[PDB]
Amino acid sequence: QLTEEQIAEFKEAFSLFDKDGDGTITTKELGTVMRSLGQNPTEAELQDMINEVDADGDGTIDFPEFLTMMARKMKDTDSEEEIREAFRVFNYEEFVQMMTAKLECEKMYVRDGVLTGDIHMALLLEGNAHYRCDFRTTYKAKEKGVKLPGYHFVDHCIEILSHDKDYNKVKLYEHAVAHSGLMVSAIKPDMKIKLRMEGNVNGHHFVIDGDGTGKPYEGKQTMDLEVKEGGPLPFAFDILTTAFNRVFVKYPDNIQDYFKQSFPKGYSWERSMTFEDGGICYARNDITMEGDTFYNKVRFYGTNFPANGPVMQKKTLKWMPSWTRSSRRKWNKT
């Protein structure tokens, strides 16, 4: 936690740039301010920090917003400077990269009035290579007045529990938890999931049906998938699995849950996936509900995957989990 002494130190540094006596700095000055405090954030880290604050685009930061950023930074252990330091206490650059990337951690922010989530993702390949992908998802409730959340993270963990040899049948699991890094009537504790996906990857067409269950308030779901057309699939099944609903996220009470609030009418998402060797995907899900069951109409489009790359050669093992875990509260602190 912040202490009084830290706040007064941040306050001094911040105030030196608040030249209008206004209580603000510009977003363009944020790096200069943090360097004045002896910090060395990367550009990528500064962009994340700025996304925490620029929902309405006005390009300034007030002291409470600055304090929140900073409180998040000191809770943060994954900053690039801090991580390298630990290595330099003694080739490890890929480790540094993976650890600073926060794999499977979705950054949730508002950009031009649209709730957006960005994630760094990577597939572990046969032979232990890492195959990177950037995700960007936009989310929009069907009902007009649903209030957009503040900045936050969703820590995801997706895995294949079982499959047949050709991946015509796949059982899938995800566990997701929202947090700041510092129950509603339409949504029952136990829900059912029905899904149909139609897609095309490098021109190969397929249809996949899903049937599942989950616990929206615990952030957990499982699904059984069956390829109905286009099987045996000629590409890595793993590129589809994050297309197979952010309702299934455990939200604490100090973060607005846009997803559970979008029901009964539902919401839709659209996503791009950008892979390191040029492959590109688009996907979309339109999510509705009837009683205790979500219905998912999913579309998936992938192109430009090299004939010879890991996706068209089925060389992926899984989506890699985060390389930094929180070792949690001891039982005595609940």
TrEMBL record:
Keyword Cell division in the entry? The reply is no
Keyword terms, alphabetized: Chromophore, Luminescence, Photoprotein
Keyword Phosphoprotein assigned: no
List residues traversing the bilayer. Answer: none
Matches recorded under Pfam families: GFP
| Residues with PTM Phenylalanine amide | 244
Please give the biological process terms from Gene Ontology that the record holds.
bioluminescence; generation of precursor metabolites and energy
Q: Which residues carry this modification: Cysteine sulfenic acid (-SOH)?
A: 133
Q: What InterPro entries has UniProt attached to this entry?
A: GFP, GFP-related, Green_fluorescent_prot
Give the family this protein belongs to, as stated in its UniProt record: Belongs to the GFP family.
Q: Which protein is depicted?
A: Green to red photoconvertible GFP-like protein EosFP
Gene source species: Lobophyllia hemprichii (Lobed brain coral)
Q: What is the lineage of its organism?
A: Eukaryota, Metazoa, Cnidaria, Anthozoa, Hexacorallia
